[PDB]
Design a protein around this nucleic acid. Structure first.
Lengths: 50, 205, 262, 151
RNA sequence: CGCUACUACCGAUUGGAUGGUUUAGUGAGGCCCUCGGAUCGGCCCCGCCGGGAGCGCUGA
RNA sequence: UGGUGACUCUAGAUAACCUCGGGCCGAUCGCACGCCGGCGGCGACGACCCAUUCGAACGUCUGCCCUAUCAACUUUCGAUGGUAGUCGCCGUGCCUACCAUGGUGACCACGGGUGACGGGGAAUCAGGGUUCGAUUCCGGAGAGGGAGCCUGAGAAACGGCUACCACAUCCAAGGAAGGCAGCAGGCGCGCAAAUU
RNA sequence: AAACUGCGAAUGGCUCAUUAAAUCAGUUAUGGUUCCUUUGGUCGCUCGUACUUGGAUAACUGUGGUAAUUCU
């Protein structure tokens, strides 16, 4: 499953092809407009709430 | 998809009628507004020509007129006690035109006492809360007191109306169509109409 | 079927337009306006078929969008604007005023009028009613709402309207002995003096009208339009003075005119 | 008799009957004004309608109907409905091929006011056209003329 | 009476195809009503000085 | 006040009401010129109400082919009428409740049939008639068959949507998309009808 | 240009399947109704930021998903 991740402050966007199910485990069973800590996507993603 | 067309009906002779066209938009009908007593809920209906109908689904307030005294007051609708069309419409307490309702009498009692000393019933009883004896006695100049004294001449309320005022609820008839205009307006029952409807309500039990 | 129709077939058009049968399938469908569909002359018919300033409808549009045509003093750019009885059509660019009037054959004649007579018109009042806090309103045959009319003015009367202000100048009562024209039926376009109105309660009143040549006819009350007080018209009349001729008399007149002209 | 023979109170809507009373003005009964109008076309209001007690909202004189359009005639043939009677209009239809006529008829259901007592089978009734009063009733009896055989 | 052909009926078997009515249920979808309330808003409590958090209330 | 043949019309007065899904009382736009903290001439667009311009919808009267090997029909599930209401844009069994037992019929009801859309009209015709009228004008109906809706002033719209029924298109089989009785053009049908 | 808004798309065209007082024709009625548009009128007739208010969203930029659509 791909991730279309946007940053409003700079209006930037990027598509990340994520293949590992462990990273996406934190997104499952979550509805739209839900705040989730996306620290499972890597080390640079630590502290990011999407 | 209900329809009010005449061509689904039989002929005066009794033979069947074969339709030449299907249902038209202008022949439509809509579900009945079974207006119940409750906090005001009114749904607007867009009708032919772009106009609007006010489908009142819940009403607890109506503008009812005491016609003998020319006193129209906004009042709380308490009950539905008689329906000429269907007795189900009284069990379900549905507000429709010409249905008989029990309404409050307190604003009519205020206008009653503002023309002070309408027919004496039980006014010498063990009661008289403060702050409303002024509306009955007051400190009035001789001219205004004489005006009230001559108003005493036309202080004649029917005995049935007096019993209703003692009960706190007036029998009234809804002269509006709640499902069409959104209001439940009418008039206080009095006279031979009141006697007829009291007889009908008693005979229903 | 659903909603209003927007076209008018050439052969279904009013016959007094004198339209052809081979010049297209459609006739100009007159716009909504002061006059009825079948009792009006659309501006395109007047500017193309009658006056011949245009050869096509596009030329009528070109003429009208230059704001050269005024109906009752107001510039009209609608080439299908319904112009009807008593309307004043003014063309200041060519400096001519016409009044849409009926001919004894029931057709809108090309009747030229002076600039002084283009300042007013005659209107038959269709109804009078008190409304809006007691103000009397009067509705005319051209849908002109006039407030505060003279209390003497009643239905079927005629009022002289100043076109600039739209206000009543004078009025003629509907009465026996008054000059009138016929605006509908078989006697359309005939001018004569009212002699007798016989009332039919719940039905149509019938008015009898005598020509200036002695001929008498009858119409329905709705088809009468009072033209003048007595026998003097308040407006100019066509080449014929409302006197309808028989086919024999018309043939004799035509033969004599051709004999004496060429 | 007693006009209140229904489950709803019967009254003329125009007339306000429970106006404030007066003890000296009481003379045994409260007195009731009667609403009546004259239909046009020279038809006289029957003395019954002016001085009656019946309540009929489809009566031309005391009800809420207008007489507009065709004024027709017919002979009364049925009086078995409530305030409605069936009249028969007879005529001759011309067949051109045979240059002759055929007797035709049709039955009209017309409203009959209680203001017309003593209406009989065979009586001629002048009826006036009104708005649809029911599924089949579109005419209201305006006048009754007795049959010659009545005695 | 023989006796090639031809057209028409009644039919045991309801042998097969095409239609249209109806009892009994069942019943899509829209509309209406009574609920529901994902979610989005402002009004509620603060800093920074320009001078992102609650079925508390409220609206869609 | 005014009007009609006729209002329970119009207008007037009074006491109130005035819909959270709330009714109007302009926060709109272009051109041209001016004299102390101010005015203003032409337009465009928009909103409420009235006037029916254009209609639409419902009623009235009279007129429709063949058939009795269709003579009685309708009335339980409204059939005829009355009262009250619901719904509707309104009148109305339109629907509901109660009540009455009505309503049509040899003057042909009811039923059935129609290679039956109706009319203006066409062919023929001494006079009378007979037959035709799918077809360019008017009115109706329908958009494969039914049904239900949204929007809108106006549609039960189909070159709008939503289902089912029949038929049928693309598919990576997960889904998506249909409606020529518009103009051409195919197929089919037929004795029978033209250019993508 | 686009896109939002407004209007139209309910006219026209085709066809004759249904339909037997039904459609239709003439005749009347709506005093029993609806009416975009045109035209004329009403449009300080309310008696208690205005020298102009608020939040969005298209178009546009940018990231995309589906084999596939005037999908988003």
């Amino acid at each position: 499953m791909k991730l279309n991740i946007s940053f409003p402050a700079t209006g930037c966007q990027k598509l990340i092809e994520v293949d590992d199910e462990r990273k996406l485990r934190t997104f499952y069973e979550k509805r739209m407009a839900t705040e989730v800590a996306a620290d499972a996507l890597g080390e640079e993603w630590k502290g990011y709430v999407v | 998809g209900i329809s009010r067309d005449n061509w689904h009906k039989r002929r005066k002779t009794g033979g069947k009628r074969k339709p030449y066209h299907k249902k038209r938009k202008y022949e439509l009908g809509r579900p009945a507004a079974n207006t119940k007593i409750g906090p005001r809920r009114i749904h607007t209906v867009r009708v032919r020509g772009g106009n609007k109908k006010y489908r009142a689904l819940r009403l607890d307030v109506g503008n009812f007129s005491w016609g003998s005294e020319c006193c129209t007051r906004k009042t709380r609708i308490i009950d539905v006690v008689y329906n000429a069309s269907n007795n189900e419409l009284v069990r379900t307490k549905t507000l429709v035109k010409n249905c008989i309702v029990l309404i409050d009498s307190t604003p009519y009692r205020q206008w009653y006492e503002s023309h002070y000393a309408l027919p004496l019933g039980r006014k010498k009883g063990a009661k008289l809360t403060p702050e409303e004896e002024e509306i009955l006695n007051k400190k009035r100049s001789k001219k205004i007191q004489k005006k009230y004294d001559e108003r005493k001449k036309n202080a004649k309320i029917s005995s049935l109306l007096e019993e209703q005022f003692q009960q706190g609820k007036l029998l009234a008839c809804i002269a509006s169509r709640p499902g069409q205009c959104g209001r439940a307006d009418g008039y206080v029952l009095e006279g031979k109409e009141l006697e007829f409807y009291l007889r009908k309500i008693k005979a229903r039990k | 079927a659903r909603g209003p129709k927007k076209h008018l077939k050439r052969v279904a058009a009013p016959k007094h337009w004198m339209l052809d049968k081979l010049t297209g399938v459609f006739a100009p469908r007159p716009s909504t306006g002061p006059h009825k569909l079948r009792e009006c002359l659309p501006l395109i018919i007047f500017l193309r078929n009658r006056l011949k300033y245009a050869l096509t409808g596009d030329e009528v549009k070109k003429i009208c969008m230059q704001r050269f045509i005024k109906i009752d003093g107001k510039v009209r750019t609608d080439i299908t604007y319904p112009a009807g009885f008593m309307d004043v059509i003014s063309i200041d660019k060519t400096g001519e005023n016409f009044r849409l009037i009926y001919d004894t054959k029931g057709r809108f004649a090309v009747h030229r009028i002076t600039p002084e007579e283009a300042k007013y018109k005659l209107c038959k009042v269709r109804k009078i009613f008190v409304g809006t806090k007691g103000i009397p309103h009067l509705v005319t045959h051209d849908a002109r709402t006039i407030r505060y009319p003279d209390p003497l003015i009643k239905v079927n009367d005629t009022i002289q309207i100043d076109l600039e202000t739209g206000k009543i100048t004078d009025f003629i009562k509907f009465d026996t002995g008054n000059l009138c024209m016929v605006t509908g039926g078989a006697n359309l376009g005939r001018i004569g003096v009212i002699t007798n109105r016989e009332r039919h309660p719940g039905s149509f009143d019938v008015v009898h009208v005598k020509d200036a040549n002695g001929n008498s006819f009858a119409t329905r009350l709705s088809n009468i339009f009072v033209i003048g007080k007595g026998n003097k018209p308040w407006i100019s009349l066509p080449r014929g003075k409302g006197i309808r001729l028989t086919i024999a008399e018309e043939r004799d007149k035509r033969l004599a005119a051709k004999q004496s002209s060429g | 008799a007693d006009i209140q023979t229904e489950r709803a109170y019967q009254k003329q809507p125009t007339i306000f009957q429970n106006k404030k009373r007066v003890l000296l003005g009481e003379t045994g009964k409260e007195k009731l004004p009667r609403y009546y109008k004259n239909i046009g076309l020279g038809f006289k209001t029957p003395k019954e309608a002016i001085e009656g007690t019946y309540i009929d909202k489809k009566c031309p004189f005391t009800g809420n109907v207008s007489i507009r359009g065709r004024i027709l005639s017919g002979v009364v043939t049925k009086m078995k409905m409530q305030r409605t009677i069936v009249i028969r209009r007879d005529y001759l239809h011309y067949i051109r091929k045979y240059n002759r006529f055929e007797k035709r008829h049709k039955n009209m259901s017309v409203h009959l006011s209680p203001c017309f007592r003593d209406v009989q089978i065979g009586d001629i009734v002048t009826v006036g056209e009104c708005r649809p009063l029911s599924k089949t009733v579109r005419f209201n009896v305006l006048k009754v003329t007795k049959a010659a055989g009545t005695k």
